[PDB]
Amino acid sequence: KPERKRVSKLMAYILRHSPEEFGLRPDVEGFVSLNELVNALKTVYPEVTEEFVREIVENDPAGRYEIRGDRIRARYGHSFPVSLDHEEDTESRFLYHGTPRRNLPSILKEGLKPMKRQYVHVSTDKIEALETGRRHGREVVLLVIDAECLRKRGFKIYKAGKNVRIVERVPPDCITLAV
């Protein structure tokens, strides 16, 4: 577990934020070559192999990554434009987003915004929404989001991870609770 986490974190940095810093040029869908990713990871962790990367992908509890044949991408979290063909979530009734309490005044005016990312990220799981919020501050609130409000306003909700969902933004009308 302790070797998988460090390598997985570098995988997220390369596939979500700065692939070009490792000489990788993603296609429009966010995929890079699996062999090219392995060599990029080896510049930092020389023991990494293709099999180890496949093990990381297969066992990742959030569904962070996707392999198609010999290509790989992050499924969410990107800070550069990507065209994603994820299935839409039409089943969830409520979604969750944890954020520092200090952001509540701004969020209740503008809704959730993507900030440095392409998409707003939310969750089907309360604990994980709150643990995500806790990365940004100690005093955190749980936002409860009416998923049908989002769909009625035209915002597609995409099944990006096992629990993670992404959407272009969350207007403040779609927030039913702040606890």
Tab-separated table of N, CA and C in Angstrom, residues 40-133:
chain	number	residue	atom	x	y	z
A	40	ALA	N	8.031	7.916	-17.629
A	40	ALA	CA	7.970	9.156	-16.868
A	40	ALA	C	8.030	8.878	-15.372
A	41	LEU	N	7.285	7.870	-14.904
A	41	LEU	CA	7.339	7.510	-13.491
A	41	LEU	C	8.723	7.011	-13.102
A	42	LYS	N	9.420	6.333	-14.021
A	42	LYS	CA	10.752	5.822	-13.725
A	42	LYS	C	11.789	6.928	-13.560
A	43	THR	N	11.568	8.111	-14.139
A	43	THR	CA	12.496	9.208	-13.891
A	43	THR	C	12.524	9.587	-12.419
A	44	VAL	N	11.460	9.275	-11.679
A	44	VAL	CA	11.369	9.574	-10.258
A	44	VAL	C	11.530	8.317	-9.410
A	45	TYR	N	10.871	7.224	-9.796
A	45	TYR	CA	10.886	5.966	-9.050
A	45	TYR	C	11.393	4.893	-10.000
A	46	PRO	N	12.708	4.653	-10.041
A	46	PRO	CA	13.272	3.800	-11.104
A	46	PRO	C	12.792	2.357	-11.082
A	47	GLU	N	12.235	1.877	-9.971
A	47	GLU	CA	11.790	0.490	-9.888
A	47	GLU	C	10.416	0.252	-10.504
A	48	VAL	N	9.705	1.304	-10.916
A	48	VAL	CA	8.340	1.152	-11.407
A	48	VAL	C	8.339	0.396	-12.730
A	49	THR	N	7.393	-0.530	-12.873
A	49	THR	CA	7.191	-1.331	-14.074
A	49	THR	C	5.762	-1.162	-14.571
A	50	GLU	N	5.530	-1.602	-15.813
A	50	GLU	CA	4.181	-1.590	-16.366
A	50	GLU	C	3.224	-2.413	-15.511
A	51	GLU	N	3.672	-3.582	-15.041
A	51	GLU	CA	2.808	-4.422	-14.218
A	51	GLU	C	2.400	-3.694	-12.949
A	52	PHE	N	3.338	-2.975	-12.330
A	52	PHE	CA	3.004	-2.234	-11.122
A	52	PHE	C	1.962	-1.154	-11.401
A	53	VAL	N	2.056	-0.486	-12.553
A	53	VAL	CA	1.057	0.524	-12.899
A	53	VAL	C	-0.308	-0.123	-13.124
A	54	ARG	N	-0.344	-1.263	-13.821
A	54	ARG	CA	-1.606	-1.972	-14.013
A	54	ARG	C	-2.196	-2.419	-12.683
A	55	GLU	N	-1.348	-2.839	-11.742
A	55	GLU	CA	-1.858	-3.208	-10.429
A	55	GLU	C	-2.458	-1.999	-9.726
A	56	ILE	N	-1.803	-0.841	-9.840
A	56	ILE	CA	-2.333	0.378	-9.236
A	56	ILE	C	-3.708	0.704	-9.802
A	57	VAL	N	-3.863	0.597	-11.125
A	57	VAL	CA	-5.133	0.923	-11.767
A	57	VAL	C	-6.218	-0.062	-11.347
A	58	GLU	N	-5.911	-1.362	-11.394
A	58	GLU	CA	-6.923	-2.378	-11.112
A	58	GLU	C	-7.409	-2.301	-9.669
A	59	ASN	N	-6.513	-1.990	-8.732
A	59	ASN	CA	-6.830	-1.998	-7.307
A	59	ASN	C	-7.181	-0.626	-6.743
A	60	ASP	N	-7.249	0.413	-7.570
A	60	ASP	CA	-7.491	1.755	-7.036
A	60	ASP	C	-8.920	1.858	-6.515
A	61	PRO	N	-9.123	2.148	-5.225
A	61	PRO	CA	-10.483	2.086	-4.663
A	61	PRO	C	-11.412	3.193	-5.144
A	62	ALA	N	-10.888	4.300	-5.667
A	62	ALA	CA	-11.747	5.373	-6.150
A	62	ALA	C	-12.048	5.290	-7.642
A	63	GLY	N	-11.345	4.446	-8.393
A	63	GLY	CA	-11.492	4.453	-9.838
A	63	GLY	C	-10.857	5.662	-10.492
A	64	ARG	N	-9.652	6.031	-10.059
A	64	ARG	CA	-9.034	7.273	-10.524
A	64	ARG	C	-8.609	7.202	-11.986
A	65	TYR	N	-8.300	6.005	-12.488
A	65	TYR	CA	-7.585	5.820	-13.746
A	65	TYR	C	-8.353	4.883	-14.663
A	66	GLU	N	-8.003	4.944	-15.943
A	66	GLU	CA	-8.603	4.110	-16.970
A	66	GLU	C	-7.523	3.711	-17.957
A	67	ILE	N	-7.420	2.412	-18.232
A	67	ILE	CA	-6.597	1.891	-19.318
A	67	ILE	C	-7.510	1.406	-20.441
A	68	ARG	N	-7.219	1.831	-21.673
A	68	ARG	CA	-7.844	1.279	-22.875
A	68	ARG	C	-6.728	0.698	-23.726
A	69	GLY	N	-6.637	-0.626	-23.778
A	69	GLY	CA	-5.543	-1.223	-24.513
A	69	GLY	C	-4.205	-0.862	-23.900
A	70	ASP	N	-3.451	-0.011	-24.582
A	70	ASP	CA	-2.098	0.391	-24.110
A	70	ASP	C	-2.061	1.910	-23.903
A	71	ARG	N	-3.214	2.503	-23.617
A	71	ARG	CA	-3.301	3.929	-23.339
A	71	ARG	C	-3.919	4.105	-21.957
A	72	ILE	N	-3.614	5.226	-21.299
A	72	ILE	CA	-4.078	5.441	-19.933
A	72	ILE	C	-4.348	6.926	-19.728
A	73	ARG	N	-5.365	7.221	-18.919
A	73	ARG	CA	-5.690	8.584	-18.524
A	73	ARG	C	-6.172	8.595	-17.076
A	74	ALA	N	-6.168	9.788	-16.483
A	74	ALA	CA	-6.967	10.041	-15.293
A	74	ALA	C	-8.422	10.236	-15.700
A	75	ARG	N	-9.339	9.730	-14.877
A	75	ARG	CA	-10.754	9.863	-15.207
A	75	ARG	C	-11.341	11.194	-14.745
A	76	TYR	N	-10.659	11.910	-13.860
A	76	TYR	CA	-11.149	13.204	-13.397
A	76	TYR	C	-9.981	13.983	-12.804
A	77	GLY	N	-10.274	15.198	-12.342
A	77	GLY	CA	-9.298	16.009	-11.646
A	77	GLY	C	-8.426	16.877	-12.522
A	78	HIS	N	-8.594	16.816	-13.843
A	78	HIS	CA	-7.726	17.542	-14.764
A	78	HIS	C	-7.784	19.053	-14.554
A	79	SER	N	-6.625	19.701	-14.693
A	79	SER	CA	-6.536	21.154	-14.769
A	79	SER	C	-6.197	21.640	-16.178
A	80	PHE	N	-6.345	20.787	-17.184
A	80	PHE	CA	-6.225	21.189	-18.576
A	80	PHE	C	-7.400	20.597	-19.338
A	81	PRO	N	-7.796	21.208	-20.454
A	81	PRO	CA	-9.022	20.765	-21.137
A	81	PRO	C	-8.917	19.332	-21.648
A	82	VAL	N	-9.974	18.550	-21.392
A	82	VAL	CA	-10.107	17.181	-21.881
A	82	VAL	C	-11.557	16.940	-22.269
A	83	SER	N	-11.750	16.126	-23.304
A	83	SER	CA	-13.073	15.704	-23.750
A	83	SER	C	-13.343	14.316	-23.178
A	84	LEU	N	-14.268	14.235	-22.231
A	84	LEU	CA	-14.543	12.992	-21.524
A	84	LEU	C	-15.879	12.416	-21.973
A	85	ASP	N	-15.887	11.116	-22.224
A	85	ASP	CA	-17.062	10.395	-22.696
A	85	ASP	C	-17.681	9.531	-21.599
A	86	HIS	N	-17.694	10.038	-20.362
A	86	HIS	CA	-18.184	9.254	-19.236
A	86	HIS	C	-19.698	9.084	-19.315
A	87	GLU	N	-20.179	7.976	-18.759
A	87	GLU	CA	-21.611	7.765	-18.621
A	87	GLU	C	-22.205	8.798	-17.666
A	88	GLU	N	-23.431	9.209	-17.962
A	88	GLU	CA	-24.126	10.170	-17.123
A	88	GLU	C	-24.791	9.484	-15.934
A	89	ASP	N	-24.697	10.124	-14.766
A	89	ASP	CA	-25.398	9.683	-13.562
A	89	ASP	C	-26.819	10.239	-13.587
A	90	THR	N	-27.796	9.374	-13.845
A	90	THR	CA	-29.203	9.731	-13.743
A	90	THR	C	-29.901	9.070	-12.561
A	91	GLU	N	-29.177	8.309	-11.737
A	91	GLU	CA	-29.754	7.566	-10.618
A	91	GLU	C	-29.668	8.313	-9.286
A	92	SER	N	-28.543	8.967	-9.009
A	92	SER	CA	-28.357	9.634	-7.722
A	92	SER	C	-29.417	10.706	-7.477
A	93	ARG	N	-29.942	10.737	-6.253
A	93	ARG	CA	-30.882	11.786	-5.887
A	93	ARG	C	-30.174	12.951	-5.215
A	94	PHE	N	-29.167	12.665	-4.398
A	94	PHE	CA	-28.414	13.695	-3.702
A	94	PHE	C	-26.928	13.419	-3.854
A	95	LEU	N	-26.158	14.487	-4.009
A	95	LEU	CA	-24.717	14.422	-4.088
A	95	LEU	C	-24.155	15.314	-2.989
A	96	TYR	N	-22.868	15.142	-2.695
A	96	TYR	CA	-22.256	15.765	-1.529
A	96	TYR	C	-20.937	16.411	-1.912
A	97	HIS	N	-20.631	17.509	-1.230
A	97	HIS	CA	-19.392	18.238	-1.445
A	97	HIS	C	-18.974	18.850	-0.122
A	98	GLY	N	-17.771	18.525	0.337
A	98	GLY	CA	-17.222	19.106	1.553
A	98	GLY	C	-16.293	20.258	1.210
A	99	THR	N	-16.400	21.340	1.970
A	99	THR	CA	-15.582	22.505	1.702
A	99	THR	C	-15.388	23.269	3.001
A	100	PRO	N	-14.248	23.940	3.172
A	100	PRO	CA	-14.062	24.777	4.359
A	100	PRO	C	-15.226	25.741	4.547
A	101	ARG	N	-15.632	25.895	5.809
A	101	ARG	CA	-16.706	26.813	6.176
A	101	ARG	C	-16.442	28.229	5.669
A	102	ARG	N	-15.174	28.640	5.610
A	102	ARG	CA	-14.854	29.987	5.149
A	102	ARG	C	-15.341	30.249	3.727
A	103	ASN	N	-15.593	29.202	2.927
A	103	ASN	CA	-16.052	29.400	1.556
A	103	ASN	C	-17.561	29.544	1.440
A	104	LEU	N	-18.303	29.328	2.523
A	104	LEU	CA	-19.762	29.341	2.435
A	104	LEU	C	-20.324	30.649	1.891
A	105	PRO	N	-19.923	31.833	2.372
A	105	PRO	CA	-20.493	33.062	1.796
A	105	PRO	C	-20.321	33.163	0.294
A	106	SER	N	-19.139	32.824	-0.220
A	106	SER	CA	-18.927	32.899	-1.659
A	106	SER	C	-19.757	31.847	-2.390
A	107	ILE	N	-19.811	30.628	-1.856
A	107	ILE	CA	-20.512	29.548	-2.545
A	107	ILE	C	-22.011	29.830	-2.589
A	108	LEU	N	-22.558	30.433	-1.528
A	108	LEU	CA	-23.991	30.698	-1.527
A	108	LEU	C	-24.376	31.825	-2.482
A	109	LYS	N	-23.408	32.634	-2.935
A	109	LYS	CA	-23.607	33.658	-3.960
A	109	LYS	C	-23.447	33.088	-5.365
A	110	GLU	N	-22.343	32.368	-5.598
A	110	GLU	CA	-21.931	31.937	-6.928
A	110	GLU	C	-22.128	30.453	-7.196
A	111	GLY	N	-22.456	29.652	-6.186
A	111	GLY	CA	-22.479	28.222	-6.381
A	111	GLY	C	-21.070	27.664	-6.336
A	112	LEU	N	-20.960	26.356	-6.559
A	112	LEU	CA	-19.648	25.742	-6.669
A	112	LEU	C	-19.061	26.047	-8.043
A	113	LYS	N	-17.800	26.452	-8.075
A	113	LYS	CA	-17.113	26.720	-9.327
A	113	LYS	C	-15.942	25.758	-9.499
A	114	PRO	N	-15.506	25.515	-10.740
A	114	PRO	CA	-14.436	24.532	-10.951
A	114	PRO	C	-13.069	24.989	-10.460
A	115	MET	N	-12.848	26.294	-10.258
A	115	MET	CA	-11.563	26.870	-9.781
A	115	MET	C	-10.470	26.503	-10.781
A	116	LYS	N	-9.364	25.889	-10.362
A	116	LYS	CA	-8.273	25.562	-11.275
A	116	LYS	C	-8.550	24.316	-12.102
A	117	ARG	N	-9.651	23.620	-11.857
A	117	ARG	CA	-9.937	22.393	-12.579
A	117	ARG	C	-10.913	22.658	-13.719
A	118	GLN	N	-11.083	21.648	-14.575
A	118	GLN	CA	-12.077	21.770	-15.633
A	118	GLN	C	-13.497	21.600	-15.107
A	119	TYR	N	-13.687	20.793	-14.056
A	119	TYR	CA	-15.010	20.424	-13.564
A	119	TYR	C	-15.098	20.602	-12.057
A	120	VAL	N	-16.315	20.855	-11.574
A	120	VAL	CA	-16.596	20.703	-10.153
A	120	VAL	C	-16.683	19.223	-9.818
A	121	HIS	N	-16.058	18.824	-8.714
A	121	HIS	CA	-16.093	17.443	-8.242
A	121	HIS	C	-16.984	17.328	-7.009
A	122	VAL	N	-17.878	16.334	-7.022
A	122	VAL	CA	-18.765	16.003	-5.908
A	122	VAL	C	-18.707	14.494	-5.680
A	123	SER	N	-19.455	14.020	-4.678
A	123	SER	CA	-19.381	12.619	-4.291
A	123	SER	C	-20.767	12.078	-3.977
A	124	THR	N	-20.932	10.771	-4.180
A	124	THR	CA	-22.096	10.063	-3.665
A	124	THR	C	-21.955	9.706	-2.189
A	125	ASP	N	-20.777	9.895	-1.589
A	125	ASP	CA	-20.475	9.416	-0.242
A	125	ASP	C	-20.168	10.590	0.686
A	126	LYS	N	-20.880	10.664	1.817
A	126	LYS	CA	-20.726	11.793	2.740
A	126	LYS	C	-19.335	11.854	3.363
A	127	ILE	N	-18.830	10.724	3.869
A	127	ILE	CA	-17.526	10.742	4.537
A	127	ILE	C	-16.439	11.214	3.580
A	128	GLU	N	-16.463	10.730	2.336
A	128	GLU	CA	-15.412	11.094	1.389
A	128	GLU	C	-15.530	12.547	0.936
A	129	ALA	N	-16.753	13.069	0.795
A	129	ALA	CA	-16.903	14.499	0.537
A	129	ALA	C	-16.269	15.323	1.655
A	130	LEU	N	-16.499	14.924	2.908
A	130	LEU	CA	-15.958	15.670	4.038
A	130	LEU	C	-14.445	15.522	4.136
A	131	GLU	N	-13.921	14.315	3.887
A	131	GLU	CA	-12.474	14.121	3.927
A	131	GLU	C	-11.785	14.905	2.823
A	132	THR	N	-12.437	15.030	1.663
A	132	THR	CA	-11.913	15.889	0.610
A	132	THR	C	-11.886	17.345	1.058
A	133	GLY	N	-12.961	17.807	1.703
A	133	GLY	CA	-12.977	19.171	2.214
A	133	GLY	C	-11.888	19.425	3.238
